[PDB]
């Protein structure tokens, strides 16, 4: 028998794990940038702004240059891991000043100059109580400033529809969603979020007929992986619906002498997603992705992407 200090006899013991890591990230970006409904040149119009949720832009896409780090970890990790599950999302929008031109005529010069509204708000809209789309073509139109769709509008005098929340200047408007849908244990495949055309957690079973999806909008998940030529793995799940209804933000509609007096507005839109990576296991077992399926995409040869917003999810009573 050993006399060592720290002598005990084995218990049967393996220190390598089985993937039970899981780190915690979080992917935010804050940005204080212009909503401008004065232009003539595209999403500068007058119509309203929406806000690509669904898109996955949290990841910041709609320009290279706001890539903070937690991305640049979140692209590490997602090397690291076999699997993710986005846990919260919290978006929080600010709305520090608020400008419209206002028209001058004189000598026929016809400028116009800018004047500060402390009276007036910023309708955040949301597409509840009806079933619209966000067309996508590169990561660019995720900008929620420039996005904007063509005859839409949050104000219709025959039918207003939409659930309209105003934020005035000096105060802000924080939404949470919950992405974690994934029930049974499985997890979303680890993606760096790189294309805009993919998509955000949660079922929404409604998919382009022209960008056929695959299973992973069912609230019963039906699919198979590769894992190599040899091995093939079948993902099977249930995953609760989730409605993500349109998110615009747009103007007061107010009709001026000519052309519907125009606004414009400085946002600080606050953006952090919370993502659990669970980080690869300490040896190699690809055939972990049997809890994996893949991020919601739309694939298809297209340009241009018609994204779902489907505004709810009727409850029954059982």
């Not at 935010?28 to 940038?33: L, M, S, T, V």
């Not at 000043?97 to 910023?122: C, M, P, W």
């Not at 980080?279 to 298809?300: C, E, V, Y």
């Amino acid at each position: 028998e050993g006399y060592g200090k720290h002598i005990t006899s084995m218990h049967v013991r393996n220190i390598f794990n089985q993937g039970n890591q899981v780190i915690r990230n979080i992917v935010k970006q804050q940005r204080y940038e212009l909503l401008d409904f004065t232009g003539t040149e595209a999403g500068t119009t007058n119509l309203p702004k929406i806000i690509p949720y669904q898109c996955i832009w949290w990841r910041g896409l709609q320009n290279a240059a706001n890539v903070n780090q937690t991305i640049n970890n979140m692209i590490a990790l997602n090397t690291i891991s076999y699997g993710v599950r986005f846990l919260k999302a919290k978006l929080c929008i600010e709305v520090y000043a608020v400008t419209r031109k206002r028209l001058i005529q004189t000598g026929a010069t016809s400028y116009y100059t800018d004047d500060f509204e402390q009276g007036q708000n910023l309708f955040i809209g949301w597409a509840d109580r009806k079933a619209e789309s966000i067309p996508i073509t590169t990561p660019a139109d995720l900008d929620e400033t420039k996005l904007t769709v063509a005859n839409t509008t949050l104000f219709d005098a025959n039918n207003d529809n939409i659930t309209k929340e105003e934020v005035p200047t000096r105060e802000k408007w924080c939404h949470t969603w919950d992405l974690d849908v994934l029930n049974h244990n499985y997890l979303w495949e680890p993606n760096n979020l790189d294309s805009q055309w993919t998509l955000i957690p949660g079922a929404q079973a409604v998919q382009p007929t022209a960008t056929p999806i695959g299973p992973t909008y069912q609230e019963i998940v039906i699919a198979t992986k590769a894992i190599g030529a040899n091995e093939s793995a079948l993902v099977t799940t249930i995953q609760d619906r989730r409605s993500y209804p349109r998110l615009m933000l747009s103007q007061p509609q107010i009709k001026d002498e000519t052309d519907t007096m125009k606004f414009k507005y400085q946002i600080r839109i606050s953006t952090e997603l919370e993502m659990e990576h669970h980080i690869k296991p300490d040896i190699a077992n690809p055939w972990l992705t049997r809890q994996t399926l893949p991020l919601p995409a739309l694939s298809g040869d297209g340009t241009t992407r018609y994204v779902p917003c489907v505004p709810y999810e009727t409850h029954v009573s059982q």
